[PDB]
Design a protein around this ligand. Structure first.
Ligand SMILES: CC1(C)COC[C@@H](COc2ccc(-c3cc(C(N)=O)c(=O)[nH]c3C(F)(F)F)cc2)O1
Length: 457
């Protein structure tokens, strides 16, 4: 009745990204293979984010030097059965024109934030944030709550939804620490700018807490005259609790522009048909898509396929035992994958590069959430140790005790799988659910035994 209009307005955003991609592939003379190459997709997506960014670190993060009226990056072409790389400079003004023209005159800011969230999801599936966490005095075992930690510095409410409790705590703790070392960080006009940002992040984090006590604790943090060690400890205590008492963090399955493009190219009317990020739409679209990736001489194609599959599905922070059943193949922790990131650095030799057909399909599909068969997944060892770390006698409170009690009663109950079950892709209505069978021999976390590169660029 109303949800019909939300699907159409979402489909219109998807449609405009695809119209944009086709126009860029055409402008760049990219072949069908080249346009489906995910490295080409990333550069094109970064160029449009860059054109509207105006060096504000709102849509993307970049390094200053070069012409501010131009923008660009690597475009990969196939010449004589071999891969080559060129750095192109495209006028920012013309990129904006092509974007708005593809979005039938609209600025379509939502289209940009959807590409930005796809970039954040790829980084959450690729890079480790352990050193970043230890640099802020946080426990490196908070890794499972770092949703959207690579989002641009001044990204708005668009990124707020996809940020984790650990990301919110990291950003809030970084502010509290700056003011502890330097009390002048809260004085003057810069202080006024920062206090407004402090209170907004506190309310954004508070919104993710699903209990009265967790939220009431965030009230004390937001309304503290001069944030310090007391607020640092309350924030890390709350991050420890969010390991047992799960917050409400949105995981949006945003796909690359090289997926939406061919769908619009072959006549899909996303505005008319509608599009929902939740449910079968991303799954069904990934079954009717073909994406290529540049592969390094030492990489396993199945492992590069899993990294991109997990990034498309905003699933780096999901239980691998669940992911494995839905995908119909074992999803390995990052430490067990023989692959690096999708992006190719300029110091890399292109003569060694090859290409691979990414296997982005799934056996089943599922929705992100009368009588159920109680199917539980034990909490990961590292998350139990991290959650029950801090001392009860250290800093006392009434809200602290109630959260401790809530954690102590949730722990034996373990992690309950939510939903009717998984569904066949042919079952588009979701009427025949399948009984999920989980393997407890495999670990639950994607970050267990993690050997990934640290995010820096
Ligand atoms: C902690 C517990 C055990 C609690 O019970 C639920 C369970 C996770 O269950 C899921 C997780 C993810 C999806 C999912 C959904 C979408 C979507 N668009 O709806 C997608 O694109 N990709 C996926 C993905 F598999 F790939 F991750 C569906 C169901 O975790």
């Amino acid at each position: 009745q109303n949800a019909t209009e939300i699907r159409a307005s979402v489909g219109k955003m998807i449609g405009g990204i695809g119209r944009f991609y086709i126009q860029m592939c055409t402008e760049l003379k990219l072949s069908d293979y080249e346009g489906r190459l995910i490295q080409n997709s990333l550069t094109i997506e970064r160029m449009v984010l860059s054109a509207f960014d105006e060096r504000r670190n709102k849509y993307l993060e970049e390094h200053p030097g070069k012409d501010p009226k131009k923008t660009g990056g690597p475009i990969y072409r196939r010449v004589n059965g071999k891969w080559m790389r060129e750095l192109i400079l495209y006028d920012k003004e013309e990129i904006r024109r092509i974007w708005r023209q593809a979005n039938n005159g609209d600025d379509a800011t939502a289209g940009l934030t959807h590409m930005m969230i796809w970039h954040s999801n790829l980084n959450d599936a690729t890079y480790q944030r352990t050193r970043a966490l230890v640099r802020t005095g946080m426990d490196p075992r908070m890794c499972s709550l770092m949703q959207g930690s690579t989002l641009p510095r001044r990204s708005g409410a668009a990124g707020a939804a996809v940020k984790g409790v650990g990301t919110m705590v990291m950003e809030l703790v970084r502010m509290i620490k700056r003011g502890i070392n330097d009390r002048n960080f809260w004085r003057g006009e810069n202080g006024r700018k920062t206090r407004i940002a402090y209170e907004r992040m506190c309310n954004i984090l508070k919104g993710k807490f699903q209990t009265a006590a967790q939220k009431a604790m965030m009230d004390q943090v937001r309304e503290s005259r001069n944030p310090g060690n007391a607020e640092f400890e309350d924030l890390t205590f709350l991050a420890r609790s969010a390991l047992i008492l799960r917050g409400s963090v949105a995981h949006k399955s945003c796909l690359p522009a090289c997926v939406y493009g061919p769908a619009v190219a072959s006549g899909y009317d996303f505005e008319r048909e509608g599009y929902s990020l939740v449910g079968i739409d991303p799954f069904r679209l990934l079954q009717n898509s073909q994406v290529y990736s540049l592969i390094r001489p030492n990489e396993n194609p199945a492992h590069k396929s899993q990294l991109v599959w997990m990034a498309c599905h905003s699933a780096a922070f999901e239980d691998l035992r669940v992911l494995s059943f839905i995908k119909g193949t074992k999803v390995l922790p990052r430490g067990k994958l023989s692959t690096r990131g999708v992006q190719i650095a300029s110091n890399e030799n292109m003569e060694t590069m090859e290409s691979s057909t990414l296997e982005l399909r799934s056996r089943y599909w599922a929705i992100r959430t009368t009588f159920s068969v109680q199917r539980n997944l034990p909490f990961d060892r590292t998350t139990i140790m991290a959650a029950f770390n801090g001392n009860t006698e250290g800093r006392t409170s009434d809200m602290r005790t109630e959260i401790i009690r809530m954690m102590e009663s949730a722990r034996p109950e373990d992690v309950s799988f939510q939903g009717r079950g998984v569904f066949e892709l042919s079952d588009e209505k979701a009427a025949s659910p399948i009984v999920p069978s989980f393997d407890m021999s495999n670990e639950g976390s994607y970050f267990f035994g993690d050997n990934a590169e640290e995010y820096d660029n």
